[PDB]
Structure 1
Amino acid sequence: MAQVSSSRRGVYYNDDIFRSDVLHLTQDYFLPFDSNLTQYFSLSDRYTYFDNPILDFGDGVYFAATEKSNVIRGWIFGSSFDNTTQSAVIVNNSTHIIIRVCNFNLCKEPMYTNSWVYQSAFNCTYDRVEKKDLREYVFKNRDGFLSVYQTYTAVNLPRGLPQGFSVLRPILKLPFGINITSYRVVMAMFSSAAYYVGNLKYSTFMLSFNENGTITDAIDCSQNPLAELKCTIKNFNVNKGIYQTSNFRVSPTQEVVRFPNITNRCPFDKVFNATRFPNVYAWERTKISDCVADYTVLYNSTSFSTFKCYGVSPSKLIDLCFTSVY
């Protein structure tokens, strides 16, 4: 549970378009530079307290794992980790790559050579079964598409996590469609290794492309005043002098909502479903005041032929407060 600094790690391609020899900057969910990652330890049995908890997906995740004998196999995403909700598994043995989304009956801890990943699964929706060492991954899930980024390299580190810049690459665009909230890590069983976990935050990054679609360098504009200056002047090399800087430092993270405490409910079952509507030349006007507008109790029975609003959007109507309604 130790915190390890991750300097300039976690860079991936947030967009699929092709860019060559440009200095592009964008606002998206990235791993912040020099952020603290939690360290978890793992390596029959191996040695005492070497286990894995249930982590938090958030809006993105950076998974970096160090291995010596391929002890880490895969991940199990989900929301509630029961069979009341759906889950996905991405694990492998042989050269067998297994990816499927089902309602799983999970074990307490997954071991997989002796393949104790699940007890059983039912109502399987999407199945695409096809078949000293540092591998790292980035997982994101928006608009019903789990994107996977990875890179893989050979190292000789006895302890700790090496520092540097790392760019990842897309492989999969799997259309799962499930709600992902929390995940786990699947470890193998036999007849030191450790992994580090970081979460993505909404920030502004600037990237340099080496005219081949390959990222040369990346700048996090919220790190230090030097990077903010570099993002402001839109360049990587800065001449000596004084320059004014824009705002790239502070960002809100929490929500405050304050509404009046009107608990009474006003009748949409009497104005709408009245006894007898009048003639068109004798149309009636009724003032509505001092209540709460729900618009969701009609979802059960009444279906609307047309509902069109002028000056407001129907989707934004639930968050609005009105002064006078007729």
Structure 2
Amino acid sequence: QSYTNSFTRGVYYPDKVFRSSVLHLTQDLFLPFFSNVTWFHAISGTNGTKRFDNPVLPFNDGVYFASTEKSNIIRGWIFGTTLDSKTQSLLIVNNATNVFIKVCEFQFCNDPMESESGVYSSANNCTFEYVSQPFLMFKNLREFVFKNIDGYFKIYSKHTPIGRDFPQGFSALEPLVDLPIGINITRFQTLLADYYVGYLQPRTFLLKYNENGTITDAVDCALDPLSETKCTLKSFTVEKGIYQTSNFRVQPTESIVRFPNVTNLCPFHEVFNATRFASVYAWNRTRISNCVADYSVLYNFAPFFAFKCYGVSPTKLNDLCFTNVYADSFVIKGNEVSQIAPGQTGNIADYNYKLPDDFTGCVIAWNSNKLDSKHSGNYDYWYRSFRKSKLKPFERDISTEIYQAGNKPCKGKGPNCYFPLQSYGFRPTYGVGHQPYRVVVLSFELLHAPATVCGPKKSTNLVKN
């Protein structure tokens, strides 16, 4: 055993909307028809592993439970992740007259003869409690569906008079309870003072409603081509003929990754860990080529003031290849970091370093006060405060001509003219807006892969046909 046919079991009302004599086609998490359901009489049935151990089952997207027991031997469930008091978990335990649902940091329960049981062990930092929500919850099949959607814990259930194991038939599960637990449920456990578990998957079903709003039948759109046809037509009756359904495709069997023989790493260490950095006026451009674009070193090196990538939003830069990579390195004031971006203005964006408006790449700002500041002031950094025109994208203007302020020629400095390069010292006593920051802009040109600056991926064997 440990598997079963399941038949047409596990359908629940997907929402709280009344419908009358219609067929509703919907996509939601359902137990597929004729799928395998795990039967736990083996392994943990009867006494099973009680008093010593019990395996924990996964909770993938949602679960379907069923039992034919009327003894109330099965009493409850725990949902959560760690399930050891390290994190929050939700415990639902039934009683003869009430239901106790609590979400707290649980360590373990007395329930992994039966004269007394379930006193529990220890708990703290509890967040919510719910009491007797539904008050209670010839054999009786007790079906439940437990689903976790955007922090809401949805419980559906149905009682069917049954002695057959999953007899053929259909019955929809009405919603029972909806809790704002707000937690993460990756694993779950049953509690004993016979049991079936199926798992839900995203599927499309056509649900048949009667005049009184009850779901009386359903079609699983992926069970067979006839069901798919019924879903396409939104009917439980199909006329004689040929109907067109979803297209078929052959799926891949393996992943083929091919990269050049290059194992050299890109010299990001030397540029970013340099002991002396260039000024904004003479900003330093180093070309990166013929190397592995491993960016793990960048995150390991230091925390950054800003790591903002334009055109490639993720930090997962190791999966791409580049065709033209440049690192532009310069030192700026903290209050100027916001100016190093497309569309920005100010003395730096306008006269020292400007990005194109279609720029692709990453701007990485690191606080370097402990290295660049001096008590006397570090006067090796010199922004060009005054310029006649605005700087072009990626233009390096290193002219040393004295700027004349209008009509007067004013050769020399003073009366109506300024030497364009203005020194400002950095000192340990300045605030975060004035302290020096090192900024490197990594310009990434992405046009297929004529050239390789590919990241730290491995090559596999080539498979043809």
Provide the TM-score with structure 2 as the length reference.
0.57
Counterpart position of 2:176: 171
Q: 1:87 — aligned with what?
A: 89
Which aligned pairs between 1:38-187 and structure 2 lie closer than 5 A? 38-41=38-41, 49=48, 53-107=55-109, 109-110=111-112, 114-116=116-118, 118-129=120-131, 132-153=139-160, 155-157=161-163, 159-187=164-192
Matched AA of 1:309: Y
**Correspondence for 2:460:** none
Q: Which residue does 1:191 correspond to in 2?
A: none
2:310 aligns with 309
Contact 1:110 1:117 in 2 (8 A): no
**Distance in 2 of aligned mates of 1:93 and 1:113:** 15
Cα distance in 1 for residues equivalent to 2:81 and 2:254: 23
Amino acid across the alignment from 1:223: L
Equivalent-residue separation in structure 2 for 1:28 and 1:255 (angstroms): 29
- Counterparts of 1:134 and 1:291, CA distance in 2: 59
More strand by share: 1
Maintained 8 Å contact 1:64/1:196: yes
Letter of the 1:168 counterpart: L
Asked whether the 8 Å contact 2:14–2:28 carries over to 1, the reply is yes
Question: 5 Å matches for 1:16-35?
Answer: 21-35=21-35
Aligned 8 A contact 2:90 2:102 in 1? yes
Secondary structure of the structure 1 residue equivalent to 2:229? helix
CA pair 156-92 structure 1, distance change in 2 beyond 3 A: closer
SS in 2 for 1:64: strand
Kindly provide the CA deviation profile for residues 241-263 of structure 1, in whole angstroms up to 9, marking residues without a partner as x. Answer: 23333248x89799858485988
RMSD over equivalenced CA pairs, Å: 3.7
> Structure 1 residues 68 and 298 mapped into 2: Cα distance closer, same or farther (>3 Å)?
same
Q: Match for 1:186: what amino acid?
A: L
Give the structure with higher Rg (CA).
Answer: 2
Aligned-pair CA distance for 1:275: 5.4
**Any conservation in 2 of the 1:104–1:118 contact (CA below 8 Å)?**
no
Determine if contact 2:295/2:318 at 8 Å carries over to the other structure. Answer: no
Cα distance change of structure 1 residues 6 and 99 upon mapping to structure 2, 3 Å threshold: same
Unaligned runs of 5+ in 2: 134-138, 327-465
Deviation at 1:321, TM superposition (A): 0.7
Alpha-carbon deviations, 1:206-259, whole Å to 9, x = none? Answer: 2233366533321111112211221222322111223333248x8979985848
Q: Is the 8 A contact 1:82 1:106 kept in 2?
A: yes
Shift of 1:88: 1.6
Give per-residue Cα distances to partners, 1:262-317, cap 9 Å, x unaligned. 8876566665576565454544333334222249827973242x72523x4437x4
Does structure 1 retain, via aligned residues, the 8 Å contact 2:170–2:216?
A: no
More moved, 132-141 vs 214-223: 214-223
Distance 1:276 1:130, change over 3 A: farther
When normalised by structure 1's length, the TM-score is 0.78
CA gap of 1:107–1:171, structure 2 versus 1, over 3 A, is: closer
Residues 294 and 54 of structure 1: CA distance in aligned 2, closer, same or farther (over 3 Å):
same
- 1:4 maps onto 2:4 in alignment: yes
By relative contact order (CA 8 Å, sep 6+), the higher-ranking structure is 1
Distance 2:263 2:61 in 1: 34
- Unaligned 5+ runs, structure 1: 189-193
Report how far residue 119 of structure 1 moved: 0.9
CA distance in 1, matches of 2:253, 2:230: 28
CA distance in 2, matches of 1:185, 1:84: 19
Whole-Å separation in 1 of the counterparts to 2:253 and 2:74: 36
With over 3 angstroms needed to count, the CA separation of the structure-2 counterparts of 1:265 and 1:319, relative to structure 1, is: closer
Task: Identify the range of structure 1 (31-40 vs 291-300) with the bigger mean alpha-carbon deviation.
Answer: 291-300
What SS does structure 2 have at the residue aligned with 1:5? coil
Contact 1:72 1:186 in 2 (8 A): yes
The 2-side partners of 1:170 and 1:12 are apart by 8
Q: Which stretch shifts more, 204-213 or 75-84?
A: 204-213
Aligned length: 312
